[PDB]
Amino acid sequence: MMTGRQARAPLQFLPDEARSLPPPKLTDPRLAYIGFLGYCSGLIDNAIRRRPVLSAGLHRQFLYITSFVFVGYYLLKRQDYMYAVRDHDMFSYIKSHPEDFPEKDKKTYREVFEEFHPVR
Amino acid sequence: MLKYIIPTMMLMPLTWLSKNSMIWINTTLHSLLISLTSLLLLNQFGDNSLNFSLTFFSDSLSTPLLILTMWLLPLMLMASQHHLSKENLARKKLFISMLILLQLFLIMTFTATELIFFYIMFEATLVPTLIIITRWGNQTERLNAGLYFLFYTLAGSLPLLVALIYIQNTMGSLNFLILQYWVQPMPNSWSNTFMWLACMMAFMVKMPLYGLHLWLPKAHVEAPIAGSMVLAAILLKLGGYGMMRITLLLNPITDFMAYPFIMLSLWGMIMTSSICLRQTDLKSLIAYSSVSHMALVIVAILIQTPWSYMGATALMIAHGLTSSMLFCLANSNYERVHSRTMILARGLQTLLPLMAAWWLLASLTNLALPPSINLIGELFVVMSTFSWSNITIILMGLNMVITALYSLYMLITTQRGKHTHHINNILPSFTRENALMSLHMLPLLLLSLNPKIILGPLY
Amino acid sequence: MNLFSSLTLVTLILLTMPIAAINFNTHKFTNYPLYVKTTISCAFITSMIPTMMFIHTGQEMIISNWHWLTIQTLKLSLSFKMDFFSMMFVPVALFVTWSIMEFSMWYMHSDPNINQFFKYLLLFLITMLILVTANNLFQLFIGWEGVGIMSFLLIGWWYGRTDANTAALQAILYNRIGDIGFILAMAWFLINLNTWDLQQIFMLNPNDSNLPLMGLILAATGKSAQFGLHPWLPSAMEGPTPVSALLHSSTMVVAGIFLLIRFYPLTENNKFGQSIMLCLGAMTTLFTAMCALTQNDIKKIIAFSTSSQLGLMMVTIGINQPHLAFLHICT
Amino acid sequence: DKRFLKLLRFYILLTGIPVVIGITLINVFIGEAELAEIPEGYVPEHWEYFKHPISRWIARTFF
Amino acid sequence: RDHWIHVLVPVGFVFGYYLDRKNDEKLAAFRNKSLLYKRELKPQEEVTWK
Amino acid sequence: LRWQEDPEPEDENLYEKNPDSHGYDKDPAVDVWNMRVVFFFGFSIVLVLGSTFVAYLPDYRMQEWARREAERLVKYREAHGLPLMESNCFDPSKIQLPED
Amino acid sequence: LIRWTCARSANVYPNFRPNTKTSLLGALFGIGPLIFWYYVFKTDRDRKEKLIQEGKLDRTFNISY
Amino acid sequence: SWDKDVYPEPPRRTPAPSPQTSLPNPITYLTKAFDLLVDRPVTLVREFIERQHAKNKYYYYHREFRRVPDITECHEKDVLCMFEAEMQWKRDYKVDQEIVNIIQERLKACQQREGESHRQNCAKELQQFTQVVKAYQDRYHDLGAHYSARKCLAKQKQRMLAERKATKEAA
Amino acid sequence: ITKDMLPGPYPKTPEERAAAAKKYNMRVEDY
Ligand SMILES: CCCCCCCCCCCCCCCCCC(=O)OC[C@H](COP(=O)([O-])OCC(O)COP(=O)([O-])OC[C@@H](COC(=O)CCCCCCCCCCCCCCCCC)OC(=O)CCCCCCCCCCCCCCCCC)OC(=O)CCCCCCCCCCCCCCCCC
Ligand SMILES: CCCCCCCCCCCCCCCCCC(=O)OC[C@H](COP(=O)([O-])OC[C@H](O)COP(=O)([O-])OC[C@H](COC(=O)CCCCCCCCCCCCCCCCC)OC(=O)CCCCCCCCCCCCCCCCC)OC(=O)CCCCCCCCCCCCCCCCC
Ligand SMILES: CCCCCCCCCCCCCCCCCC(=O)OC[C@H](COP(=O)([O-])OCC[N+](C)(C)C)OC(=O)CCCCCCCCCCCCCCCCC
Ligand SMILES: CCCCCCCCCCCCCCCCCC(=O)OC[C@H](COP(=O)([O-])OCC[N+](C)(C)C)OC(=O)CCCCCCCCCCCCCCCCC
Ligand SMILES: CCCCCCCCCCCCCCCCCC(=O)OC[C@H](COP(=O)([O-])OCC[N+](C)(C)C)OC(=O)CCCCCCCCCCCCCCCCC
C-alpha cells in the first residue's frame, strides 16, 4: 500500500523524518515485553540443553534480554514511524480532497426518527 | 483490572519457585487472597459501569462471574491435590500453571472492553482446558473428548471472528461502551440473518445449545475434577456473558431469529433432564443437568427482558456453585470406589453421614429450593418466559418436576438404601473434602441473604 | 401494637433457637428432644397472647420488617401477615406439635438419631409457620417447598427401606406437579397485577381470575392430596407415626386448603373456580372414604380419612364458605 | 466429621466474633450518620454520601 | 527474608493497584469538565480527583 | 505375552500412616498447615470478612439514594398538584415529529 | 456391571445403522416436537401481538416483564 | 422517622375501653408486664446508645445530580453528550421505579389499614396507583433488556405519532 | 476388564452367538 511512499529513498530502516518523532521510552511496556521474551528464550536455552534453568549461564540470559531489547527498540521506532506516516498521508489526502470528505450535517435526536421495536 | 491480572500472573513464579511440599499450600493461600481482593469490583453504580481503562471495564454482569472465577481456583487446587499426589513435581506445577493461566484468561475475558479482545481471551481459554482434559483426564476417551471440545468451539467461533471484524469495519469500533451509543438497528435480511448466526452460534456452542451439546458429556465427564469444576462453573458462562454483550447489536432481528433456538432450548431442557433420569454414570448425569440448566439461560437471554437477564445471571452464578459442588461430591465417591457408575456404591449415608448432608444440600440447590439463588434465577426466568408466552409454563413446570426427580434419584441411589456389601474401602470423609463442600455451599447459601449483587446490570 | 408484634416474632425466633443449638453443638445432648418440646410448649404460650388480643379487638397487622430485594417495581420484604388465619392456626399447630413431640419422646426412644428426628420435625414446624404467616407469594413458596422437603426427609426417615424412599419421592413428585400451578399463579399475579403481596392482589381484585385460580387449585390438589394427585398421602404412611400424625394428618396437608382459604377474596367472585373446587372436593371425599372402607393397615385407614376430610374442606371452600373450611382445619 | 465441624466453627468464629463485637462497638459508640442538607458552597466527599461508618470507610478506602 | 515467596502475590497486587492509579492520570482529560460534576475549585485544591 | 509394564499400584489410605490426617498431604506437618491455610484464609478471611464487606457495601447501585430521591420528587409534586409521573419521558416541545 | 454400563453408553453408535426405522423414529421424536412447539408458541405470540397492537389485550398493570 | 406526606396515614381513632364484664382481661396485665419487664430496659439501653451517638455527631448527604442535556438535544453518535444523557435517563428510570414502589406501598398500607371496608376507603390510592402505573408503562414498558434513552425516545415518538394521527382523524 | 469381555456387535454366526452367550455368563439356549 505505502510502498511507493518509501520508494524514492529505498532500504531505509528509519528515515530522517523519523527523527521528528518521539522515540519509545526505555520503560515502554512493549519493550519490557520484548525483554521478557528474551528472558524466556534464555530459560528455554537452559532447558533444552539440560542446564539448571534459572541459575546456569546468567551472562547468556542477560545477552538474550539485551539482544531482544536492542532489536525491539528499533522495531518499535520503525512501527511508530510507519503509523505516523499512515496518519500523515491520510490527513494530507483528506485536506487535499475536500469534495470526497464533506462535513456531514449532524442532527440531534429531536429531529432523528428511529423506529421503535417493542420487546414483548 | 491490572490489580487482579498481575497477582494472577505472580501465582506463576509462586508455584514454580515454591518448595516441593509447599506448592499446594502457597497457591491455595495466595489464590484465596486474590479471591478476597476480588470484592473491590462491587463498586458498581446504578447508571454507569465501573470503567477502569480503554481495555477493561466491569459492570454488574462481569463482576459476579469474576468473583466466582477467582473463587473457583483455590477450590480447584483443593479438589485436585489428592489425585495428583503421586504425580511428577514438574507436571504438578504444569497442572497448576494451566489452572492459573485459565484464571488469567478468564478474568480478562469477562472484563474485556473491546469485543475482539474478548474473542481472543475467550478462545485463549480453550488451550489450557484442552491440555488439562487430555493430559490429566483419567481415561482413553479424554483424547476424543479433547477433540469435540476443541472443534465444536472453533467451528462456531471462527464465524464470530469474521462477524466481529465486520462490525469493526462497519461501526469503526468494537468497544462495548462505544457500541452502547452507536448501535444501529439490524433489519430483516439474509445478510443480517447470517450476521446473527455468526454472532450467536459460538456462544450457543459454549452454553451449550441443545443439539450442539454433545461435546459437554464427554468434556466434563472425561476431565479431571478441576477441569470439570471450571468447565461447568465458568466456561459455560462465557457463552451467556457473550450473548448478553452481543445481543445489543442484534436488534430487532433477534425477535424472530430466537424462535428456533428457544424451541431447541425449551424442548431441550425437557430432553436432557429426562436423560438424567436414565444416566448410569453419575458424572454424566451432572453434565446433562448442566445442559438442562443452561437451556433456561439461553431462553432468558433470547427473550431479552429485564427479568430474564436478571434471572439468567442469577442462574449462571447459582449453577456455577451448585454444579461445581456436585462434581466434587461425585469425585469424592470416585476417589474411593474408582468408578463413576452411580448404582455401584449405594447406602453411603450409613457410612458417610456429613457428606450425605452435603449431598442433600447440593441436591436441594440443584432442584432450586427457595430461597436459594438457584430458585431466584429459575423463578425469574419462569416469570419472564410466562410473559413471553403463557404456554411456556407447561414446559417450564414439567421441567421442574423432572429436575426434582433426577435430583433426588441421584440422592436416593448413592446415599440411601442398603450399602453395597463387597465395597469396604469407604474411608471417612477427609477434612479437605468437607472443606471443599463447605466452600462451595456456604457462599451459595449466603448469597440468598443479599442476592442483589448477582442480579446483573439491570437490577 | 408493641406487645402483639414482639410476641409474634418471638414465637418464630424461639422456634428457630433449637435449630441454632443443635447446629452449634459439641457434646451429646442432655435430652435435646425435651428441649425442643419445652421450646414448642413455650412458643404455644407466647403465641396465645396475640391470639387473645385478636379475640378481644380483631387486632390484625402486617410486619414487613426486612427489605430483602427490589426487582425494579417488585419490592420483596420479609413480611408476616398476622390476621385471623395466622392467629388461629399458629396456636393450634403449636399445641398439636407439642403433643406430637411428647409422643415422640416415647415412640422414637429406641431411635439412635432421635435428635435428628426432632431437628427435622422442628424444621417442618418452622417451614409450616413460614407458610401460614406469609404475606407474599415468594415467602409462602419458601414455606411451601420447605414443608415438601421436610416431608421427603421424614417419609424417608428409615432410608434403607426401599418403600420409604419410593414413598418420599412420590410425595415430592405429586407436590411438584402442584407447584407447577403455584408458579403459574405467581407468574400471573406478577405479570398482571405487578405484585406477589396479598394486599395488592386483593385491592386490585381482578375479574379475569380463571387462570391464577386454576393454578392455585392445582397447587392445592398437589398439597392437599385431592383427586388426581391423591395417592402420595396414603403412601406417606411409610414414615414414622409422629410424622404421619403431625405432617400428613393435621398440619402440612391442610396447606393447600389453607392456600385457597388465603385467596378467598378471589374465589368468592369466581363461580367457575368455586364449582371446580366443589366438584374436586366432592370427588376426593367420596373416593378416599370409599377406599378407606376395605383397608387393613390402620395408618392407611386414617390417611384416607384425612384425605376425605381435606376433600370436605375443599367442598366447603367450593360453596363459598372459607371460614368454615378454616374452622374445620383447626378442628 | 466432628473434627471438621469443630474446626469449621472455630475458624468462622475466630474472626466472626471479633467482627460482631467490632460492629457492635461501631454501632454503639461511633454510631450512624444523620441526614443533613448540603451547606451552601460545601462540596461533600464521595464517602460522605453514605450513612453507616463501615460503608463510609469502604467508600473512602477502596472505591 | 526467610519467607520471601509470600510477597510475590501481595506486591503484585500493590504494584498492580499502583498501575491502575497511574492509568487514571492518563484518563483525566474530563476531570472537572463533565456537565454533571464541573465546579469551582475549593481553596488549597488543584484537582477534583486523582 | 505383552510388554514390560509396572503393575497397578494399590490405592493408598492416608489414615493408615497418619490417623489424624486432614487429607491434604502425607506429611502430617504439611497436612496440618495446609488445613490451617485453607480454614483461616478461606473461612476466617474470605467468608467472614467478605460477607461483612458485602453487607456494608456503600449503597450498591444507588438503590437507597433512588428511594430517597423518589421521596423528594413525590413530596414536590404531591404538594404542587402535579401528576406523580408523566407518560412522556421527554418534553414534547423538544421533539420534532416526522410530518405527514 | 461394567458390561452393562459400557453397553448403555459406548457400544450404541458402533451398532447403529441408519435405516427406515431409525430415520423415521429419529425424525418423529427429534424434530417433530420442535415443529409442534414452534407452531404453538408462534401462533400464541402472533395472536397476542395482534391483540396488543390493536389495543385489545388487557395490559393495565403490566409493568414488570 | 419519615415524611408523613410521601407516606400518609389518616388519624388514628381508637375507642376507649368500655368493659362490660367483671372478669379482668389478661391483655391489660400482660401490657403492664411488657411495659415494666421489656419496654423500660429496651428504652434505657436505647437512651444509653443515643447519648453515645450525641457525643459524636456527624452527617451524611443526599447526592444532588444537576440536570444535564437529555438525549433529544444530543447530536447523533456524539458519545460525550449522549453518555451524560444516558446516565441521566438511567437515574430518572431508577427514581421512577422507586416512585411506583412508593405508591404501591401506599396502596398495600391502605388495604391493610382500612380492613374489611378497604374497597370503598382506598379509591384514592387505587386511582393514584392506576395513574402512576399508566405513566410508568407508557414511559418504560417493552423497551427490552438493552433499554436506553434512544429506545425510550423512539417509543415516545411512536406514541406521539399515534396520538397525532388519532387527533387528526377525529377532526 | 478387557476387550473380549466388553459388549460388541450383533452375533450372526452360531459360534459368535455361542461365545457372546459365554461372555454374558448365560446359556446359549437362553441367550
Ligand atoms: C451476638 C453474637 C453472635 C455470634 C458471634 C459470631 C457470629 C458469626 C459470625 C458473623 C460475622 C459477620 C457476618 C456478616 C454480618 C455483618 C453484620 C450485619 O450485616 O448486620 C446487619 C444488621 C444491621 O447492623 P448495622 O447496620 O451495623 O446496624 C444498623 C443500625 O442502624 C445501627 O445500630 P444501632 O446503633 O441502631 O444499634 C446498636 C446495637 C449494636 O448493633 C448490633 O449489635 C448489631 C450487629 C450484630 C450483628 C450480628 C450478626 C451475626 C449473626 C447473628 C444471628 C445468629 C445468632 C445465633 C442464632 C440466634 C437465633 C437465630 O446495640 C445493641 O445491640 C444494644 C441493644 C440491645 C437490645 C436488647 C437488650 C435490651 C435490654 C437489656 C436489659 C439489661 C440492661 C438494662 C440496663 C442498661 C443500662 C445501660 O444487623 C443485624 O441484623 C443484627 C442482628 C439482629 C437483627 C434482628 C433480630 C430479630 C429479628 C426477628 C424478626 C425477623 C426474623 C424472623 C424469622 C422468623 C422465623 C423463620
Ligand atoms: C452473614 C451472616 C449469616 C449468618 C446466618 C447463616 C445463614 C446461612 C448460611 C449457611 C448455613 C449452612 C450451615 C449448615 C449446613 C451445612 C453444614 C452441615 O450440614 O452441618 C451440620 C452440623 C450439625 O449437624 P451434625 O449432627 O453435627 O451432623 C450432621 C449429620 O451428619 C446429618 O445432617 P442432617 O441432614 O441431619 O442436617 C442437615 C440439615 C438438613 O436439612 C435440610 O436439608 C432441610 C433444609 C430445607 C428445608 C428447611 C428450610 C427451608 C427454607 C427456610 C429457611 C430460609 C428462609 C428463612 C427466613 C424466613 C422465611 C423467608 O441442614 C440443616 O439443619 C441446616 C440448617 C440451615 C439450612 C439452610 C437451607 C438449606 C436448604 C437448601 C437451600 C435452601 C435455600 C437457601 C436458604 C438460605 C438461607 C440463608 O452443622 C454444623 O456443625 C454447623 C457449622 C457452622 C455453620 C456456619 C454457618 C454459616 C457459615 C458462613 C460463614 C461466613 C459468615 C459468618 C456467619 C456464621 C454464623 C454462625
Ligand atoms: C458450531 C457449528 C455451527 C456454526 C455456525 C456458525 C454461524 C453460521 C453462519 C455463518 C455464516 C458465515 C459468516 C457470516 C459472517 C457475517 C458477516 C456479514 O457481514 O455478513 C453479511 C454479508 C453481506 O455481504 P456484505 O456485508 O459484504 O455486503 C454489503 C451489504 N449488502 C448485502 C447490503 C450489499 O454476508 C455475506 O457476505 C455472506 C454471509 C453468508 C455466508 C455463507 C457462507 C458460509 C455458510 C455457513 C458456514 C458455517 C460454518 C460451516 C462449518 C460447520 C462446521 C464444520
Ligand atoms: C442473637 C443474635 C442477634 C443479635 C445480637 C446482638 C444485637 C442485640 C440486639 C439489638 C438488635 C440489633 C440492632 C437492630 C438490628 C438491625 C436493624 C437494621 O436496621 O438492620 C438493617 C437491615 C434492616 O432492613 P433494611 O430495610 O433497613 O435494609 C435492608 C437493606 N436494603 C435496603 C439494601 C435491602 O437488615 C437487617 O436487619 C438484617 C436482618 C434481617 C433478619 C431476618 C433474616 C432472614 C433471612 C432470610 C434469607 C432469605 C430471605 C428470602 C425471603 C425474603 C422475603 C420475600
Ligand atoms: C458473588 C458472586 C460469586 C459467587 C461465589 C462467591 C464466593 C466468594 C466468597 C466471598 C465472600 C462472600 C460473598 C457473599 C456474601 C453474602 C453474605 C452477605 O454479605 O450477607 C449480607 C446480608 C445483607 O443484609 P441486609 O441487606 O439486610 O443488610 C443491611 C445493610 N446494612 C448492614 C448496611 C444496614 O447481611 C445480613 O443479612 C446480616 C444479618 C444477619 C445475618 C442473617 C441472620 C439470619 C439467617 C437465617 C437464620 C434462620 C432463619 C430461619 C431458618 C431456620 C433454619 C433453616
Swiss-Prot record, chain B:
Q: Output a single Gene Ontology CC term carried by this record.
A: respiratory chain complex I
Source domain of life: Eukaryota
Membrane topology field: Multi-pass membrane protein
Which is an annotated GO molecular function term of this record?
ubiquinone binding
GO process annotations (BP)? electron transport coupled proton transport; mitochondrial electron transport, NADH to ubiquinone; mitochondrial respiratory chain complex I assembly
What reaction does this catalyse? Answer: a ubiquinone + NADH + 5 H(+)(in) = a ubiquinol + NAD(+) + 4 H(+)(out)
Which residue windows are transmembrane per the record?
A: 22-42, 60-80, 98-118, 147-167, 196-216, 224-244, 256-276, 284-303, 308-330, 351-371, 391-411
Sorted keywords for this record are: Electron transport, Membrane, Mitochondrion, Mitochondrion inner membrane, NAD, Respiratory chain, Translocase, Transmembrane, Transmembrane helix, Transport, Ubiquinone
What's one Pfam family here? Proton_antipo_M
The family classification in the record reads: Belongs to the complex I subunit 4 family.
Q: What function is annotated for this protein? A: Core subunit of the mitochondrial membrane respiratory chain NADH dehydrogenase (Complex I) which catalyzes electron transfer from NADH through the respiratory chain, using ubiquinone as an electron acceptor. Essential for the catalytic activity and assembly of complex I.
What protein name is recorded for this chain?
NADH-ubiquinone oxidoreductase chain 4
From Swiss-Prot, chain C:
Name the reaction it catalyses. Answer: a ubiquinone + NADH + 5 H(+)(in) = a ubiquinol + NAD(+) + 4 H(+)(out)
Provide the topology term for how it sits in the membrane. Answer: Multi-pass membrane protein
A GO CC term assigned to this protein in UniProt: respiratory chain complex I
Where located? Mitochondrion inner membrane
Chief location bin: mitochondrion
Which intervals of the chain form a coiled coil?
none
**Disulfide links within the chain:** none
Q: Which residues cross the membrane?
A: 4-24, 43-63, 84-104, 114-134, 140-160, 171-191, 213-233, 241-261, 272-292, 301-320
A molecular function annotated in GO for this UniProt entry is: NADH dehydrogenase (ubiquinone) activity
Keywords for the protein's UniProt record, in alphabetical order: Electron transport, Membrane, Mitochondrion, Mitochondrion inner membrane, NAD, Respiratory chain, Translocase, Transmembrane, Transmembrane helix, Transport, Ubiquinone
Biological process annotations from GO: electron transport coupled proton transport; mitochondrial electron transport, NADH to ubiquinone; mitochondrial respiratory chain complex I assembly
Q: Which domain of life is it from?
A: Eukaryota
Known EC number: 7.1.1.2
Which family is it part of?
Belongs to the complex I subunit 5 family.
The record describes its quaternary structure and partners as: Core subunit of respiratory chain NADH dehydrogenase (Complex I) which is composed of 45 different subunits.
Q: What does this protein do?
A: Core subunit of the mitochondrial membrane respiratory chain NADH dehydrogenase (Complex I) which catalyzes electron transfer from NADH through the respiratory chain, using ubiquinone as an electron acceptor. Essential for the catalytic activity and assembly of complex I.
Name of this protein = NADH-ubiquinone oxidoreductase chain 5
| Biological source species | Ovis aries (Sheep)
Query: Gene that codes for this?
Result: MT-ND5
